[PDB]
């Protein structure tokens, strides 16, 4: 009876034809030439070739997969003999995957398909696959292919046989931990973990933090009254519609795409356009590059929100966590280095120590949102230094040491000390943490909320419109007009942009960056800042899916850099204005911005740009202080 199943497998391998070629026979022959004793069988071809064996495999694979292994081994040996070990079955499939939470007591011994993220992987273990044994009582020998030794001799007392080690074969096996995507986990629930096992050629293909697609068998094993631990026999691991592609390409073709997306980030918040665009750049992220010496340039864009409390700084992160396809949100107080980063923990199911990824490891290839960043401990910050700057995490615990990569973008909202960021002080004095952290972030935004009449009225109007419920209809109409993008559609667009394009800079953009950074350096920030700015234009080019980065991106990147980092021959004219003001204003005197305008600019002694730049520099040089939004100017020193 099973001979018919073997014959059907033999036909499906040797005689099946697709694309006018014997694709399965040719691929198995190529594997034999490579000496890879494994065959990747596609389930979508198997269902199309024969439905009855597919029904048998779907309902009772318990005897089918031994038949698969032996038939593939026999056919591959026949092919090797024609051209001049047990071959492993690998299954590729595209059918609908059952959710992990939906696995139940009904899918026992059934082949299922799953998707998730790897959080922990064990070390390799050697398992027997072919044994030869000898009786100690009478030296009778035999071969054996869960397996247990015979209780009596075939020729001697109970348990007479011993294993002939030099005439046996063994195979490798690895234990894996899978869990559902946290983005698909509703709040109030810890993501469900799942144990998976792989052997031979399927081992060491994944590391913690890897997102994979699974084909395997749901089964249980004994390790609670009758709580049998479930585990998965791994069979195959894999790791947009055409109309969706056209829709997102038209969205890219939109002449107002950048502003539409800028408004689309938290439309229920007013203003904050600069930080909105910066967060857009963070969402796109930079482009990876590799040095010829093997080092990798960190392409992640890390932004520190460092403004006064109550400025919608937390709401922005909470909105990004919705938008980004891969997002992790956690508070600084409720986290730890062992939790944020990877850790080594013992698996009670297999009684072995496992390397387990952390929160930032889970955010690999995505964005992590952290709040109250100023309130975490310094050791956690030291680990985050490595995570940000080297994209790696170093672990030295118990008696084992390892290094694990983490390509995680970090968006940190930090509260400046003394509550309110005093403008009289350098940013270092308004901060309580390691100074080198300022050298880690690419940009910082010290947002201010100075009281104003008309701007507050407009903000109040927006908030009353939101609470009235009119905002819902307004957003719906804007989406219908194409001026606002749906959050799900925005996430789909972001994923498509991330997966497809990877731009590179142009010589025109580089030369302006070099000139502007030279001017900034001469005025004064390190060389690292110029290379960090490249991430912004790469991110913008990724947003536009342009083949190369462009200077028209560099303009907005420079504007954001100026409005972020500088929050706290024309130079000769500026310094001449400084000298003329030092002569005009004795120490301790007071004046107003409009008075200076009328007396120096309306008289054309100096230009208005020179006025603004000189006032800015003198305020940084502790010479003068600006008060009451420019209505009062006081010379604080020489």
């Amino acid at each position: 009876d099973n001979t018919e199943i073997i014959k059907s497998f033999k036909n499906f391998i040797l005689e099946f034809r697709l694309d006018s070629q014997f694709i399965y026979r040719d691929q198995l022959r190529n594997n034999i030439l490579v000496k890879n004793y494994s065959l990747t069988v596609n389930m979508e071809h198997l269902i199309g070739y024969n439905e009855d064996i597919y029904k048998k495999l779907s309902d009772e694979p318990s005897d089918i997969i031994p038949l698969f292994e032996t038939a593939i081994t026999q056919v591959a040996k026949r092919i090797s003999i024609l051209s001049r070990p047990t071959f492993q079955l690998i299954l590729n499939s595209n059918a609908n995957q059952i959710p992990l939470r939906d696995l139940d007591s009904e899918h026992v011994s059934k082949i299922v398909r799953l998707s998730g993220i790897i959080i922990s992987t064990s070390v390799l273990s050697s398992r027997a696959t072919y044994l030869s044994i000898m009786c100690r009582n009478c030296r009778h020998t035999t071969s054996i292919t869960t397996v247990s030794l015979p209780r009596s001799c075939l020729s001697c007392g109970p348990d007479p046989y011993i294993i002939i080690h030099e005439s046996s074969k063994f195979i490798d096996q690895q234990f894996l931990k899978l869990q559902e995507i946290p983005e698909l986990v509703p709040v109030g629930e810890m993501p469900r973990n799942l144990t998976m096992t792989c052997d031979r050629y399927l081992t060491n293909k994944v590391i913690p933090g890897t997102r994979v697609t699974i084909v395997g068998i749901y089964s249980i094993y004994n390790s609670g009254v009758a709580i049998r631990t479930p585990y998965i026999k791994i069979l195959g691991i894999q790791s947009f519609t055409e109309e969706e592609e056209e829709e997102f390409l038209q969205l890219s073709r939109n002449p107002k795409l950048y502003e539409i997306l800028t408004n689309s980030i938290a439309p229920s918040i007013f203003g904050n356009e600069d930080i909105k665009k910066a967060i857009v750049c963070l969402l796109m992220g930079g482009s990876k590059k590799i040095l010829p010496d093997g080092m990798r340039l960190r392409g992640d864009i890390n932004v520190l929100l460092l403004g006064d409390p109550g400025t919608a700084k937390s709401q922005l992160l909470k909105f990004v966590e919705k938008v980004s396809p891969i997002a992790v949100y956690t508070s600084g107080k409720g986290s730890s280095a062992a939790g944020l980063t990877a850790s080594v923990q013992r698996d009670p199911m297999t009684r072995e120590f496992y390397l387990e990824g952390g929160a930032m490891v889970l955010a690999d290839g995505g964005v992590v949102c952290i709040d109250e960043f100023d309130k975490m401990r310094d050791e956690d910050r030291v680990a985050i230094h490595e995570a940000m700057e080297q994209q790696t995490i170093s672990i030295a615990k118990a008696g084992i040491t390892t290094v694990l990569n983490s390509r995680t973008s970090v968006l940190a909202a930090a509260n400046p000390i003394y509550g309110r960021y005093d403008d009289l002080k350098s940013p270092g004095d308004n901060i309580d943490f390691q100074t080198t952290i300022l050298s880690a972030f690419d940009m910082i935004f010290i947002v201010k909320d100075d009281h104003n009449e008309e701007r507050d009225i407009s903000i109040a109007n927006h908030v009353i419109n939101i609470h009235t419920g009119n905002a819902n209809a307004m957003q719906n109409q804007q989406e219908e007009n194409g001026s606002e993008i749906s959050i799900e559609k925005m996430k789909r667009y972001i994923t498509y942009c991330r997966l497809k394009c990877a731009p590179r800079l142009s010589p025109q953009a580089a030369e302006k960056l070099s000139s502007n950074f030279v001017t900034i350096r001469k005025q004064l920030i390190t060389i690292r800042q110029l290379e960090a700015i490249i991430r912004i234009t790469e991110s913008l080019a990724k947003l536009e899916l342009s083949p190369i980065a462009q200077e028209r991106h560099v303009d907005e990147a420079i504007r954001l850099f100026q409005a972020s980092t500088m929050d706290a021959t024309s130079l000769s004219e500026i310094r001449r204005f400084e000298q003329e003001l030092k002569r005009r204003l004795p120490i301790g005197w007071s004046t107003s911005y409009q008075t200076l305008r009328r007396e120096f600019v309306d008289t054309h002694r100096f230009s208005q740009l020179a006025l603004d730049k000189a006032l800015y520099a003198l305020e940084k040089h502790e010479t003068i202080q600006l008060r009451h939004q420019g209505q009062n100017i006081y010379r604080s020193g020489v």
């Binding site: 590059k289 270092g428 050298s439 030279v518 004064l524 060389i527």
Partner: protein, 195 residues
């Protein structure tokens, strides 16, 4: 070759690699011959590149950063224990490369005082007492707390390391990216060619 200028630092590195000559006296005294070099200034400014070149070029260069004292035991699976070698001891007749020298602990400082002065290590522990040779040259880099070096003051206030520790370095150099636009362009054109 990756650093433009800094001829004196390169000369000092070459002389340190060459080293002096040790002597012995009829009274049993011994004279130090090796040379040490210390680097100070802004962190990213050329200290990492020079240290990388020194570590890759020297045949017996050992990298260190904040078990170097070689006075700690590692235990076997059966329970018995054995000492593990330290970098300062392994680098005998070699060179020691230190990065983030400011971040090293006080125990490391009090241990390295004797290493730099008498070229030896005096181990005194519970049930273990021995003396080991530490005839190694030392090159280290340190950075100020503020990140920006105050060129008007000595490292005794910019980094605030003990004067006794600093005096054990034969040569000291301070580098900081004082920007000259044409010279920075000339040196960074090579970097731009890699982008």
């Amino acid at each position: 070759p990756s650093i433009y200028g800094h001829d004196h630092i390169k000369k000092a590195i070459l002389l340190m690699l060459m080293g002096g000559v040790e002597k012995n006296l009829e009274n049993g005294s011994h004279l130090r011959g090796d040379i040490n070099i210390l680097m100070v200034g802004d962190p990213s400014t050329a200290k990492s590149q020079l240290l990388r070149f020194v570590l890759n070029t020297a045949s017996l260069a050992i990298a260190t950063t904040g078990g170097l004292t070689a006075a700690v035991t590692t235990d076997r699976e059966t329970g018995e224990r054995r000492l593990e070698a330290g970098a300062m001891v392994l680098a005998d007749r070699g060179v020691v490369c230190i990065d983030e020298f400011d971040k090293m602990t006080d125990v490391d400082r009090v241990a390295i005082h004797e290493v730099m002065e008498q070229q030896t290590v005096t181990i005194a522990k519970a049930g273990i007492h021995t003396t080991l040779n530490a005839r190694c040259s030392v090159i280290a880099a340190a950075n100020p707390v503020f990140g920006q070096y105050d060129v008007n003051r000595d490292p005794h206030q910019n980094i605030a390391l003990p004067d006794s520790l600093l005096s054990r370095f034969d040569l000291l150099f301070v580098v900081t990216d004082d920007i000259n636009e044409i010279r920075d362009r000339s040196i960074s054109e090579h970097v731009l060619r890699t982008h």
